[PDB]
Symmetry: none
Subunit: 146 residues, 2 copies
């Protein structure tokens, strides 16, 4: 019970602090695996894990980046041996990007750190709060973007 | 069986995707070059004041060698000053620079603007029981209020 109602402002403030705790969790996870990797780099890695081999055009669209800056960065990650480039089945031109075994290990290690840290925090919460938290973040995800 | 945990944790990896992307975007929009661990370092510094490397690394949950390296970088980028230890020591303290504080403030204000825009879109009917749950999350996680 009950609450309520809750104003935008108090909901936003609570979500803001929650967002800092999730960044803390991510920072811990990313740094443990790769202390140098950037935001757009890791996002690229996750995209490829989630969608599998895709052309640079498609990658760029999902990244929200210009195709030109995507090529440069893909190349860096190729040099870090996290991404391979593959011929299309079969276009000219393109050209598809996919994770190396290494790229895959990066994404899965970061996830495993995140879930261990989350689990640790969740153990400290009452079962009813845990459930309420899933509800709260799901509702937020539903509302926008959406 | 139980427990699981765990099932909740999994539901949470999925449920938190958006907030995380919004957070990551907000950092990236102020400085293109700052990593997420780097940004967390700055937030810890605004919350904890000047602290030494051992304390920073522990609060970050990152290995000290790597922590030391990312403080060096942030020093190079004028976001962090190294200060003398108040008592004895030997070890130098790390603290925010004015520009450092602006970065933290800017990223925070921009993320808040995106969050509230999305909160305006939740039906008034469903605006119940949200704060309680979120607050329990941050208390359990030890995260200070944003504010």
């Amino acid at each position: 019970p009950a609450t309520a109602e809750e104003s935008v402002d108090v909901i936003t403030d609570a979500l803001l602090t929650a967002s800092r705790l999730l960044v803390a969790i991510s920072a811990h996870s990313i740094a443990q695996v790769d202390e140098n990797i950037t935001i757009p780099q890791f996002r690229t890695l996750v995209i490829l894990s989630n969608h599998g081999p895709i052309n640079l055009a498609t990658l760029a669209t999902l990244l929200g980046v210009q195709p030109s800056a995507t090529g440069r960065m893909v190349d860096r990650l190729v040099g870090a041996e996290l991404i391979d480039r593959l011929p299309h089945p079969t276009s000219r031109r393109e050209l598809l990007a996919a994770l190396t075994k290494r790229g895959r290990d990066v994404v899965r290690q970061v996830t495993e750190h995140r879930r261990t840290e989350i689990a640790r925090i969740v153990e400290q919460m009452a079962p009813a709060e845990r459930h309420g938290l899933v509800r709260a973040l799901t509702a937020f995800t539903e509302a926008g973007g959406e």
